[PDB]
Amino acid sequence: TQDLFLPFFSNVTWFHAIHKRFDNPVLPFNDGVYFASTEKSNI
Amino acid sequence: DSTECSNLLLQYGSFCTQLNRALTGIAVEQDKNTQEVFAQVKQIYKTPP
Numbered sequence: 608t609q610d611l612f613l614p615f616f617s618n619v620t621w622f623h624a625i626h627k628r629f630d631n632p633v634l635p636f637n638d639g640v641y642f643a644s645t646e647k648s649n650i
Numbered sequence: 651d652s653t654e655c656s657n658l659l660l661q662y663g664s665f666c667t668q669l670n671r672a673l674t675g676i677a678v679e680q681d682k683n684t685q686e687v688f689a690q691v692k693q694i695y696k697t698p699p
């Protein structure tokens with residue numbers, strides 16, 4: 608099937624949440640976005 | 651040079667793929683004919699003076 612997909616072996620920008628600077632960028636949404644969250648304490 | 655090359659290819663590519671497989675099999679067959687008629691004996695011998 609041909610559709611919107613995440614290409615394999617793609618470079619995915621990884622954004623942290625804590626450094627004592629807390630920053631969350633306004634990332635552009637183009638053609639759908641895959642978002643991965645790997646934490647245990649529902650931040 | 652179509653814009654929607656992906657859509658037309660996804661719809662109709664297996665037909666052309668099987669036809670190209672058949673024609674490639676024909677070409678390999680012709681190579682088999684050339685090998686059959688010209689490589690009956692593979693012992694290459696030195697050309698005598």
Ligand SMILES: *[C@@H]1O[C@H](CO)[C@@H](O)[C@H](O)[C@H]1NC(C)=O
Pocket residue numbers: 616617618
């Ligand atoms: C990954 O990053 C490099 C730059 O660091 C880039 O040249 C390459 O296109 C990217 N490729 C992948 C693996 O998505």
